[PDB]
Design a protein around this motif. Structure first.
Motif: not given
Ligand code: FOL
Lengths: 557, 555, 140
Positions: A379-395, A405-411
């Motif tokens: 899962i390419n993590a993105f800042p707008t994604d809510t937890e309710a979304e991320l969780n539904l997506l895992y189920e 697995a959630l992936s935060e390699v970009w950051a």
């Molecule tokens: N182009 C681009 N790609 C990216 O992947 C990207 N990611 C970020 C930072 N992304 C994120 C993504 C998710 C959460 C987040 O809500 N994380 C959850 C964990 C989810 C879980 O483990 O179930 C948290 O609240 O800890 C925070 C920052 C910013 N700009 C980007 N820009």
């Protein structure tokens, strides 16, 4: 927080590649440096390690592309880095970018953010010369075909049947349909032809499929350029072009050693289209990498319905590989675009659209299992994604029997890839793959197309224009019918209609035209109209690009 | 004993060695494998004020089917000077890829006077030409795309002078129509391709002082005109940044070596008619700081390469050539004496003595720039002692030092006799360099002082097209530019039949083209071949490389 | 134009006379001042559609066929002349004529009335023939 992409590529501390190479067990005399941060590795490395066993092979793919963007290579690099942080001995193999896009819309990093291969700027431009090698091998043949006619046309070609086009590595639409050989008897033979972009050259595909330089020449000898008046094919072999084309590629055949921001070794080598070709990097790089490493990450172009399919049903078929797992890269936003939500409204939480668009991902996962390969979703993590979304997506991934697995390699570079890497290693340790190409070559073209279309695209069936039916008859008649099949189709739907997002039911593919690549060794049925030579936009990036007296490069990335 | 053979058997020193041997740091060298590298421009900037060593232009008498061997003699003079303990390097042009697949594929030089590795030099080398090719073709595409986008600049697609390039001999691309397929696909127009070394962008690389000057130049390039007749430039298309970018590496000269390990530069390589046939200013001006002695060359006979070497390359860079060599053969002078190619093993002491007026003109021409000339008589097995001896006397009676040179055979030892004469000419015969003309003249006066003094013509004529093109060019303020004569190299005149020293003739200027980017005017007398073609039995058909990398058919 | 169209069809059917299409001197004609037709490329579209070649149109009164009418003694002389019209060359350099294409009977047919001079008059009713009318530079 995150610096821009080019910014990150400047401030990378890169190790001398010569070091990385001795680290992998490569000798100095198998290393031709291009500066200190790029090298070209001999094919003799493979030859002396031929009998060693292969590392594990991990294919990275993605769900159906979208406006929303999904980031496949970013995941691949940062998957590789995470693997390295866990002490694993690993390389990643990736495709070289076409130069052209650098001046139109793009260019961008090999990967992105903190997950990149480098030096960025050399990779996006001339790199080690692999594409000029291809450009000039391709064009020499064209120029040999044309000279042939000029000297009395002994092979008795019909110039109007000539399929071998020219290539240039720029987005130049005006070169799509030209007339050459004008000016009179002293100047060629008037004929209709055109240019394609160099990465879309069949010569590019041969490099990406050849086992060595002698195999690459052999293949060159079977390239079909045109026909005689009686209807018999004429090859490059027949023109005795293959030795010269082979010559022009003697360095090009060597894969290019580079590294990730975190100094993880990586090969960039080849880089074909993934519609009229298979959209994978060289077999040469990937096979070499399987000897040097216990773990190899590689990717394929477009979605899993195309690249992943062609990775299995062509690349491995030829090399005799057996992927050990495959990662499907997905984004919560693209899934929502697949659920019907428009671009602009994709930040707004919408669990309904997510679930309904999840069918795109569910269908791919199912497709990967049809090859006998265990699947892990990133899962390419993105800042707008809510937890309710991320969780539904895992189920949902779970309900569908896939680890996720959630992936935060970009950051977070390799640290953001560790949950995912553990799911791969965990998968490798306890669900070994049972690899099987989707179809047997000794079916009929129409059989192999339906197989792909019905099993992978979920198509009801296939339709064929008269032109298609005729090509096929003719090709099957020339004995090219027991060849693999390379669908050229839009990447934006499972279907041949780019508007049909998600998981379209009750539809049918239509094959308009069938072409051949006797060099690469495959059939290319075409459904839409393929752009083998895109054009620049109205405000192209070439207008804003500059470099000042201290080599500071604005406007590029 | 062949040339490719001798090229395999070279004991090549690693390039990195020589670089630091010359006082280049590790960080100014970007290797391409162990035996090729690129030198940074910072070497010039940081030795900016250190003194130039001596500049020794090699040139030749009027070309002929006898084949005079100009490069070989440059390499074999460089080797000689090195054997005399002199810090020296040579600077030569990079050859086009294309010919390797037609007839050619030769040594940079020959016999035992080569620059190596021969096979990379004739192929992709360090990619300088692909950089050129793409910098040229980007711009073409940018022009065509402009039109596609509403043609804001209001260009007349039919006025477009900016062609495409590819570095293969492909005559089928000389005249084409592009942009077909309908409104989605461009704008139909007639254009063509030219070999990449014939590019203005190649010319610019070879005259540009640095990367920023290369960019500025690009900005001034003219691609066509508007419907009103107003020129339109790459600057107007905002292309120069992108072209400069694609050349960031190509701008660096390439260090390689001779068979006797004498460091050499190979950088650039333009046409010697529609351009000035020199290697890059960058390479020679870097090379001036790294040695006391720099040998270099220029394309075709001295009436062209040498004239344009002096009046263009030196003018721009502010060089002052200290000596000049003029190569000649006995058999080439005998062709200029009337004897045909088949009969030149035969001794013929009159034909050599009427043919010598060619060399005697060139030498008088070198004297007009205020440069000490020295002759080299490229020795050949069929040359008699009476012949050779008649030659010395004639060079002497003309007031020029001369030496026999057996470099093709005897390596750098063969060239000692010349190398001494040169150093003797350098220690006592100081040049007083002067460009043949001043830029403040009108175009036609510059062609005239060229036509008269050098070519020995009585006068110049102009077609209507030439008068009008000049009228217009001069009208656009491009009058105050140097002049680059596009003429057949096989005569002093514009007639390839006129061997020897033709008197009482005229030049006729059919056409005149511009190179606002390279910064010169190009008068044309013949029709110029900017895209040769492959032959009937091309060499691409027997070229082969086997399982071991052994290459047959190439050279 | 029939001859032009016979030349072009000839190539299309396997080019037995072994013409070099780039040596073809027989152009087309139309009787309008239309500059855009001076230099064209014909035979495009692929194998089913002719042989790509460079040609163009001249104004009809400048046709060599116009000059033959103005020089012929009768219809049989006009056909004979038509048979000697040269259209192009073979690859070996030999000329190829309309006679060789057996076009002259058809061309003659198309001119069976044209060969007759036209009786008209002057304002003052003086009888007058108007007949033919060639260029006076490339013709007489
Ligand atoms: N182009 C681009 N790609 C990216 O992947 C990207 N990611 C970020 C930072 N992304 C994120 C993504 C998710 C959460 C987040 O809500 N994380 C959850 C964990 C989810 C879980 O483990 O179930 C948290 O609240 O800890 C925070 C920052 C910013 N700009 C980007 N820009």
């Amino acid at each position: 927080k995150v610096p821009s992409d080019i910014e990150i590529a400047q401030a990378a501390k890169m190790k001398p590649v010569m070091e990385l190479a001795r680290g992998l067990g490569i000798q100095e005399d198998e290393v031709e440096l291009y500066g200190k941060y790029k090298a070209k590795i001999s094919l003799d490395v493979y030859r002396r390690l031929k009998d060693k066993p292969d590392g594990k092979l991990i294919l990275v793919t993605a769900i159906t592309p979208t406006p929303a963007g999904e980031g496949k290579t970013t995941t691949s690099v940062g998957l590789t880095d995470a693997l390295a942080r866990l002490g694993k001995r690993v390389m990643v193999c990736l495709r070289e970018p076409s130069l052209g896009p650098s001046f139109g819309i793009k260019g961008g990093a090999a990967g992105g953010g903190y997950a990149q291969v480098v030096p960025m700027e050399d990779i996006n431009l001339h790199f080690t010369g692999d594409i000029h090698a291809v450009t000039y091998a391709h064009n020499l043949l064209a120029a040999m075909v044309d000279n042939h006619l000029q000297q009395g046309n002994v092979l008795n070609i019909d110039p109007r049947t000539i399929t071998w086009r020219r290539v240039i590595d720029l987005n130049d639409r005006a070169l799509r349909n030209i007339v050459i050989g004008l000016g009179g008897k002293a100047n060629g033979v008037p004929r209709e032809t055109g240019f394609d972009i160099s990465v879309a050259s069949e010569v590019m595909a041969c490099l990406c499929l050849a086992s060595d330089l002698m195999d690459l020449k052999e293949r060159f000898s079977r390239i079909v350029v045109g026909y005689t008046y009686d209807g018999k094919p004429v090859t490059a072999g027949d023109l005795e072009a293959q030795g010269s084309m082979a010559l022009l590629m003697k360095d090009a055949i060597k894969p290019n050693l580079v590294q990730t921001l975190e100094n993880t070794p990586a090969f960039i080598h080849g880089g074909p289209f993934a519609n009229i070709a298979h959209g994978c990097n060289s077999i040469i790089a990937t096979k070499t990498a399987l000897k040097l490493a216990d773990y190899v990450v590689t990717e394929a172009g477009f979605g899993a319905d195309l690249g992943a399919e062609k990775f299995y049903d062509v690349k491995c078929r030829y090399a005799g590989f057996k992927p050990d797992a495959t990662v499907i890269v997905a984004t919560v936003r693209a899934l929502k675009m697949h659920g019907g939500v428009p671009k602009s409204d994709l930040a707004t939480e919408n669990l309904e659209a997510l679930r309904e668009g999840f069918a795109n991902l569910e269908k791919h996962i199912e497709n990967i299992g049809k090859f006998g390969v265990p699947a892990v979703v990133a899962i390419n993590a993105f800042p707008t994604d809510t937890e309710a979304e991320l969780n539904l997506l895992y189920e949902l991934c779970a309900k569908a029997g896939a680890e996720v697995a959630l992936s935060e390699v970009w950051a977070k570079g390799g640290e953001g890839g560790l949950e995912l890497a553990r799911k791969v290693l965990q998968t490798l340790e306890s669900r070994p793959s049972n690899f099987h190409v989707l179809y047997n070559l000794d079916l009929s073209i129409k059989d192999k197309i339906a197989k792909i279309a019905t099993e992978i695209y979920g198509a009801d069936g296939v339709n064929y224009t008269a032109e298609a039916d005729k090509a096929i008859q003719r090709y099957e008649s020339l004995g090219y019918g027991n060849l693999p099949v390379v669908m050229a189709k839009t990447q934006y739907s499972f279907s041949d209609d780019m508007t049909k997002l998600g998981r379209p039911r009750n539809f049918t593919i239509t094959v308009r035209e069938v072409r051949l690549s006797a060099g690469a060794g495959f059939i290319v049925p075409i459904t839409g109209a393929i752009m083998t030579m895109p054009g620049l936009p109205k405000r192209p990036a070439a207008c804003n690009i500059d470099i000042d007296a201290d080599g500071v490069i604005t406007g590029l990335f």
